[PDB]
Design a protein around this nucleic acid. Structure first.
Ligand SMILES: [Zn+2]
Lengths: 102, 104, 159, 75, 187
RNA sequence: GUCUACGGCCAUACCACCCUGAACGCGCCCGAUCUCGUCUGAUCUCGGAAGCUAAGCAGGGUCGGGCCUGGUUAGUACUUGGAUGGGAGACCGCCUGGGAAUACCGGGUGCUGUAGGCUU
RNA sequence: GGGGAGUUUGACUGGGGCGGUACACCUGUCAAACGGUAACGCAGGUGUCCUAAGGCGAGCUCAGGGAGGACAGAAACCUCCCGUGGAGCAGAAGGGCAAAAGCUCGCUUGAUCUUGAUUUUCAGUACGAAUACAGACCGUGAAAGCGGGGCCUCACGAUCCUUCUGACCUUUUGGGUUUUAAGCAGGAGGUGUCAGAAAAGUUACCACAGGGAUAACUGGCUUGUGGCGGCCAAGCGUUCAUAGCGACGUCGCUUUUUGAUCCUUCGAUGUCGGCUCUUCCUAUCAUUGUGAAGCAGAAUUCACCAAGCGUUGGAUUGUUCACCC
RNA sequence: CCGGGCGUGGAAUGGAGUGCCUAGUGGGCCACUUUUGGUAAGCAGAACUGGCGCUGCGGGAUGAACCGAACGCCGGGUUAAG
RNA sequence: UAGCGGUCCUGACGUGCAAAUCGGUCGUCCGACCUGGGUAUAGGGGCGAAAGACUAAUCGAACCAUCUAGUAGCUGGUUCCCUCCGAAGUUUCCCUCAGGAUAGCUGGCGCUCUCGCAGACCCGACGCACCCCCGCCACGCAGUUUUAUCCGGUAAAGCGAAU
RNA sequence: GUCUAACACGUGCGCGAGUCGGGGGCUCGCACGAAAGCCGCCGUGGCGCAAUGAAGGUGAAGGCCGGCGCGCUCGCCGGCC
């Protein structure tokens, strides 16, 4: 306070960004291409500084890429289950389930 | 702490381990005279002054207890002195604790 | 910040690495140390009796005393700008040999054998360790194709 | 009053101005701190070495003759 | 500007050093010529010593001279000293030999001439032999003086063995603490 | 091939489950007077040798987990050294050298000293 | 026995014995992959405790979970299975440990006597603490071995003086004997300002040496707090986001507030407010010229160019500030 | 421990080793990079290296530190930062 | 009113007429009044209708002389020329923080060897000279890279790896 | 700013197992001299050649080997270095 042992005490709580972070991801129907960026550009005016906006090259919040994702799902290596899709390698001990029905 | 009254250990005069009886130490008073006390008196003598510096700012709350060992061999009178780490309580040869049966 | 403490900042140093928290494998006990071969000092943690101080964790120096189950070691401690040749005791669980000298001894043996063989053949070969010279002039055969055309990648965004 | 605390940086050049760097090595050195049992025993060996010369040299005149002859007798 | 460092520019081993009375100065004016124009490293070293100060040319005790000249292979050779020769009373055997030193004490000179040897002054030596020709060269001990037992590791360190400066040797002078573990600690 | 006692490395040796068994080799297994110790001959200890390899143990199987070792991750992240390089800043590019770790995709799944057997 | 006298009345310190020990200590971190390292930097602990919580030797495995069993239940006690330290190691935290360093027993005092060496902090001085050997007496275990305090890192102390134990010790003054005294060794009595003075205030009656190395003013750097705006636009404005405003956010400016700092003067810059006088700035209360409006007129509100010219008379306080006719 | 036989081993530099006596200092400051306290400070506190201190010259107009740069007295030529 | 005082102008002068005076306006002016001379009280002492006032232009302890040049970690200064070398502001301890001690950094005096006056002869996987070193240690060192072998746990990265 | 005296330390200059006129004394000779020269003084004595103990005190080298003493640890003459 009078600097005779000055050291602050907790107040507020922030998050640290990194060049290339992803502060907000919106998912919707492809028809809403110009609603997504239109709305999301507002957040550029609430956050400090400049933040490039961007349209993902992925199906959703998945690890995956352009819509060959769904081809892979047809191949059954990707299982639609929950807000994301569960990956499946060809490892594992179900070499009788993959027989009975893959 | 606590220590039993009788324990065997090296009796220097004997030359071997022998049993010893332990009595905890307490200070003396004056030989009858001692030239320290004698000069201190003749220095206090005369008009004025407290010559040798009295000691008032105390800071220690326990004295280094000391055990006095007596031999027991007939005509091995010897008595030898030994120390122990500090302590805020002391007992001697008291009631020993058996465990595994303790009730609050 | 703190000052004197026999083991400061040895939370990770003496820590029995990242899976081997077991008892001491016995070969470290069973190794034969002699008077005057270069050990090196890496402190363990399980021994609990006789550790070198953390100033000597990693240094390496001659050995000059051999007790029952702990050797003395002469190592160079760095202090203010003088360098001291200090002597210590270390339980043998913290020391180990150091190939630094052993490789030199092997190459000594090959040098002397080569000298003897030069005695036998009359020809003076080059004795050890001429340092690494620059490259020689060699022909690169290109039969198989004409070289690959290599060209920069245009920018793309992967957030 | 108030004083300003230290700052410790020039004491790195201070040494190297002309500071030595080696412990002044030497050949065989002072047996101070060796295992005293070994010390006693090795001393007995030494005392009966520089005694026992009608032991030592009278049982090494043989090896003197032997090497001093053989080092040529290879020829 | 070069980056050399200058603190060792000048060598302190001085070249024409302290040379103050005319006899020694003239001896130097003689051996300088020999040092220049004779490859005899012996003359180099002898002249290099004719500069030193007396605390660096201690007196060659005659007993030392005897037991260093007796050694095998050193018969009929002049033994040369740059310091001076003081006779010893530790020796009863009359000498046997021939010297060549700057200054020799009267007792030692008496006993040498009685022995039937010779005394050679450096001019006599130079005209005898323009260089080291069968000449042994000695020196009185130069770690002899007292102050060396004062020098060294400062006393009070764990394993000095040096002599402090105290004004007597009585029991009460320094032997109080830092000397006997009955009084606080020992060296 | 393989086992037994002591081991060194201490997971390529662990864990799970199924199959296989080149002496009495280990072991299960039958008893408790002697030795011994427990509330219990379960354990420990002793004395045995009727059956047993059902178990341990050894070997094998596993689109096995684990573990070891490779790739892809990447010359990316990172940094020694340089500039009167950009930027208002936050940061960043370059010259020069060094150069990783996940996710993911391969491969492997005890070796071996010593003294001692057998080929069920 | 302050009637009278002598003297003392710690240091650190974002100015000042106010607060607090950063004054001896030890752990984790800062601390930048030797390893040293700073602040009244951050999270913490100590002035003890233990006849065993020491030393050996043997035997068992802990935390918790799952299925069962009369009372019995969420939890007593018994049994089976899973069980990589998830528990316990006297206490802070870190390290370390699974036929142990834990748990239970069994026996015991190596928690003893005696030289030297080394580490730890550093002048490579001591104290403290620790390392590894050697010479004795021992302990346990069949034995190999292990043990000279606590599983390791903290848990404690100089000269002088006092006190105790030690040898059939030396001296006790011309000699002898005996008391007593001084010696020599090892422990203890303590110095927490923890390398170790014995110590209460007040000076507005004050003094001398100094200090801008250090406060109280202006002046500088900063602008958190103070004041002035700007951006985004859910809403208020019956209808309507922007006539006029503006929340949740965010970017600046100004030095007309208050702080933070110590750079300049302590061998001196006269430090509140008021009175008188000049001049300056503009983010404009009024006036000249203009746009806008939820603007009919009248008033009034927002904004633009703009400091040429105005911005009062009094009650109350010293008032700056305020308040009222 | 005594005797015997074989010589020196990677580049680049250069003479090393050793003793005695001893004045001044123990108020620092700044900068590239790393880093703690703070909102930040021409603020407080740390590591490395270099400077200012103790030092002038050209250049940044002006200046303690920045850039170049290191000094006896001069003539000729050539540059660095500019 | 004289006499005695000395309120307000915060009037005058403020290197003054004056080391405290002047002009006006002010309180008292028969009582605890004003005043000359004599006499007493003396420095930790007197004297005080009490302000620490007065004690010779000095008083919360006068003046003079001596001890005496008291003492200082504190400011001030510390006198001729050139030449050579050239820092520290950090460690530890201190009633230590504007100071010393100690280390470090500094200069001076030197020393022990190198052996480049190294002929009229004659080599090193040891340097120098090279006639060649009988006389010769190329011995040694490094704020450096190289080749080996070691040590750590920051940057970076991870949570479908424990906390 | 060792200013001067007294210490002490080390370096340097000059005289040795010693060194030293240090205080006294002697020539009478006193301008120069309060000096200079001389000594059973030659040195009582300082400092040194000898340390250590608290103090009684003790205080600096062995080797070969002849025998007898069991060469037994060892001793006594031995001859020698
Ligand atoms: Zn006894």
């Amino acid at each position: 306070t009078g600097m005779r042992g000055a050291f602050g005490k907790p107040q507020g709580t922030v998050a640290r960004v990194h060049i290339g972070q992803v502060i907000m991801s919106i998912r919707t129907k492809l028809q809403n291409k110009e609603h997504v960026v239109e709305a999301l550009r507002r957040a550029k005016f609430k956050f400090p500084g400049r933040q490039k906006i961007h349209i993902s090259k992925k199906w959703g919040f998945t690890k995956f890429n352009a819509d060959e994702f769904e081809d892979m799902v047809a191949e059954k290596r990707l299982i639609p289950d929950g807000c994301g899709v569960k990956y499946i390698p060809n490892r594992g001990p179900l070499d009788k389930w993959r027989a009975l029905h893959s | 702490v606590n220590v039993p009254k009788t324990r065997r250990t090296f009796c220097k005069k004997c030359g071997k381990h022998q049993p010893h009886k332990v009595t905890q130490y307490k200070k003396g008073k004056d030989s009858l005279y001692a030239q320290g006390k004698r000069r201190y008196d003749r220095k206090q003598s005369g008009y004025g002054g407290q010559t040798k510096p009295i000691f008032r700012k105390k800071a220690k709350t326990t004295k280094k207890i000391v055990l006095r060992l007596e031999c027991v061999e007939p005509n091995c009178r010897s008595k030898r002195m030994l120390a122990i780490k500090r302590c805020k309580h002391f007992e001697l040869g008291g009631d020993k604790k058996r465990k595994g049966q303790v009730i609050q | 910040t703190n000052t004197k403490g026999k083991r400061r900042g040895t939370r990770y140093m003496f820590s029995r690495p990242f899976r081997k928290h077991g008892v001491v494998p016995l070969a470290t006990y069973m190794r034969i140390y002699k008077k005057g071969d270069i050990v090196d000092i890496k402190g363990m943690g399980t021994v609990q009796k006789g550790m070198p101080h953390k100033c000597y964790h990693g240094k390496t120096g001659r050995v000059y005393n051999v007790t029952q189950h702990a050797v003395g070691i002469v190592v160079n401690k760095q202090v203010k700008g003088k360098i001291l040749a200090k002597r210590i005791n270390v339980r043998i669980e913290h020391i180990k040999h150091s190939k630094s000298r052993d490789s030199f001894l092997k190459r000594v043996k090959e040098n002397d054998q080569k000298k003897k063989e030069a005695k036998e053949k009359g020809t003076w070969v080059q004795l050890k360790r001429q340092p690494a010279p620059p490259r020689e002039a060699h022909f690169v055969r290109t039969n198989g194709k004409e070289p690959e055309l290599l060209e920069p990648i245009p920018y793309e965004f992967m957030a | 009053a108030k004083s300003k605390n230290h700052t410790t940086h020039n004491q790195s050049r201070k040494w190297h101005r002309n500071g030595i760097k080696k412990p002044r090595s030497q050949r065989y050195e002072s047996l101070k701190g060796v295992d005293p049992k070994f010390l006693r025993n090795m001393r007995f060996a030494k005392k009966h070495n520089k005694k026992g010369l009608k032991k030592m040299q009278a049982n090494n005149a043989k090896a003197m003759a032997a090497r001093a002859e053989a080092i040529k007798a290879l020829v | 500007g070069v980056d050399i460092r200058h603190n060792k520019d000048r060598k302190v081993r001085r070249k024409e050093p302290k040379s103050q009375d005319i006899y020694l100065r003239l001896l130097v004016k003689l051996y300088r010529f020999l040092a220049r124009r004779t490859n005899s490293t012996f003359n180099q070293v002898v002249l290099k010593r004719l500069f030193m100060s007396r605390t660096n040319r201690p007196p060659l005790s005659l007993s030392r001279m005897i037991r260093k000249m007796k050694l095998p292979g050193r018969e009929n050779k002049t033994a040369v000293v740059v310091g001076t020769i003081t006779d010893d009373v530790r020796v009863q055997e009359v000498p046997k030999l021939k010297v060549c030193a700057l200054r020799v004490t009267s007792r030692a000179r008496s006993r040498i001439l009685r022995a039937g040897g010779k005394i050679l002054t450096f001019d006599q030596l130079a005209l005898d032999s323009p260089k080291g020709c069968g000449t042994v060269l000695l020196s009185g001990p130069r770690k002899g003086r007292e102050v060396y037992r004062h020098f060294g590791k400062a006393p009070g360190t764990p394993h000095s063995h040096t002599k402090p400066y105290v004004r007597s040797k009585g029991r009460k002078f320094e032997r109080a603490r830092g000397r006997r573990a009955s009084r606080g600690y020992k060296n």
